């Protein structure tokens, strides 16, 4: 199923960094011409990737990340950054080195890190 975007038993809040993650990082990446394969969870049935969940045990996508930020799901920007890293790393692990989507992920991840390098201090 889709990853959880809310959890009443997980401590969450909205920090200055987390608002930067929502209003600068996600916004910048979402507008990128390479971002669309990351907008929604990988649908291994629709995409005919029958072994996707054999190889990838912790799926993540930008749609989930954006909803978690909207729900104040995270306690720290660190947690949100790790979700982005999981999303990109999953793509490198599952797909072929020569696939377009790997190149697209590499260009998106570089922008993600550029923006994180300018995140405000907590």
């Amino acid at each position: 199923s889709m990853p959880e975007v809310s959890n009443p038993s997980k401590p969450g809040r909205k920090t200055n960094q987390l608002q930067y993650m929502q209003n600068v990082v996600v916004k910048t990446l979402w507008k990128h011409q390479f971002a669309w394969p990351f907008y929604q969870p990988v649908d291994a049935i629709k995409l005919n990737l029958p072994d996707y969940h054999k190889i990838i045990k912790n799926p993540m996508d930008m749609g989930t990340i954006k909803k978690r930020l909207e729900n104040n799901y995270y306690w720290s920007a660190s947690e949100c950054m790790q979700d982005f890293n999981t999303m990109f790393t999953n793509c490198y692990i599952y797909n072929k080195p020569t696939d377009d989507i790997v190149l697209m992920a590499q260009a998106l991840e570089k922008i993600f890190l550029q923006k994180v390098a300018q995140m405000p201090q907590e």
Partner: peptide
Amino acid sequence: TGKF
């Protein structure tokens, strides 16, 4: 199989 695979993506693209």
